[PDB]
């Protein structure tokens, strides 16, 4: 009847809008989107291509709070997320970069059939429409490889209309030679190491931010089989009652803006796309998760899957600055250094120490999931990551350099692959209550040591020629606070005191085999259910090197094909 649809997609965000778009391509399938926020079509702080940061702390920022971070000096961290049609794509930094090919290949090696770079690449392309650079932008260093960028996809990608060459970016380009990191034409072809003028998620015909709604929703909102409920919060799924021990989702419980708490039903499937900080909570509230936590919070267990909310992996981000003799200008540049780029002469002794620590990191992570992940299993997971870092020389850092205003040069930077793992769990069965989110930042020695290594490497870049002729001094942290010959620990103290979340959480409904603590299968179906999937950052089993939206769009495009395929029987 009147609350029944074929599919229900929970969360009209980065990933959810893809799935809703693709599923509604079949004009005889009905799709309901549920979104807690609303349209931001006309929110200027979203729409503004130069508006990054403006929306922080507003009504469209969930502004989730972590617990005290006991490995990082005790402070709680704000974890930002978009509450809006388009989700976190509405408030993010707009950077478009993907992942290392061999790091996606690891997903299949781990036991997830069909997930490799070769499998995913067509779906990156399918999502994308890249606008080639103008002359001004080419002189500023903009480039791309036509073979790895799409031209028909919903997500417009391009460079700023204001991009121009300037003394800072020109000097940086040459100074990177001294540092040993080559220029590359396109970081998005599976090999990310180098430095590059990366494109952004931007509509250059409007000069607006290209969020997921501008891409996958508004051009398609004429489809009468695609339905949207804004200001509508999904609280939990409910189930079909009947002695199928395997759980069949019947629908979703929802709260509307003006108070009505009701149900909507799905004839085929329910797709959960609320993000890595909410999808696992929705599962827990629906009885899918750790039965000890569920029972404690007065929820009946429906599926005993105790790693829902576990294996949370995030990065942390720090910032450095210097000051020119005069005004610094030009492009914003990304660098993706490997372990040997960052540590140079000392790489092999750094690698040996790391090697010698893996089993201890694994032993220590066991207690985080109260023994639900076994030591053996964490050792094998950490070995896959170690082998990427060292054997395959994937990038271990992102470093952004940009003009900071007038005299200023600013660098933002993060380690890509820390080993720390945490979790997120409901604090009660009230959907409106804040979860306990613990990413465990700085838990393991590598996580801090690598960040300090990156900082030391930036400091050296700023002092290298020809860039050094432009730069009078370092202003942050500056030599007074952290002297030129300072030890790793001196850096780690400062970085701990000054870090923020990089807002890249993954893993909270991980796609791995159930036997090593997976929550979803290789077709993104929740274990123990017939017809529930998770399609968002929750399912990435490991961190990726680049900025998340590109990979999340690709995963949602591929997921969509799998869902369609599965329907051509049932
Ligand atoms: C400040 C900042 C800056 C950056 C980034 C993040 C942040 C916070 N990122 C990361 C990237 O933007 C992010 O990982 C993805 O947008 C996440 O997409 P998801 O689909 O997983 O969740 P996303 O958060 O997009 O979608 C979840 C949706 O579910 C909704 N929702 C949640 N709970 C619900 C409920 N119970 N009921 C109904 N709806 C619900 C939310 O409101 C939201 O619309 C980024 N990436 C990048 O590629 N380039 C960049 O430059 C940056 N920079």
Author numbering: 2 to 571
What do the authors of the reporting publication say about this deposited model?
The flavin adenine dinucleotide (FAD)-dependent glucose dehydrogenases (FADGDHs; EC 1.1.5.9) comprise oxidoreductases that catalyze the oxidation of first hydroxyl group of glucose and other sugar molecules, using FAD as the primary electron acceptor (systematic name; D-glucose:acceptor 1-oxidoreductase). Recently, fungus-derived FADGDH has received attention as the enzyme for glucose monitoring, especially self-monitoring of blood glucose (SMBG), exploiting its oxygen insensitivity and narrow substrate specificity, in particular its lack of activity toward maltose. The structure of AfGDH consists of two major domains: an FAD-binding domain and a C-terminal domain. The overall structure was found to be similar to that of the fungal GOxs reported till date.
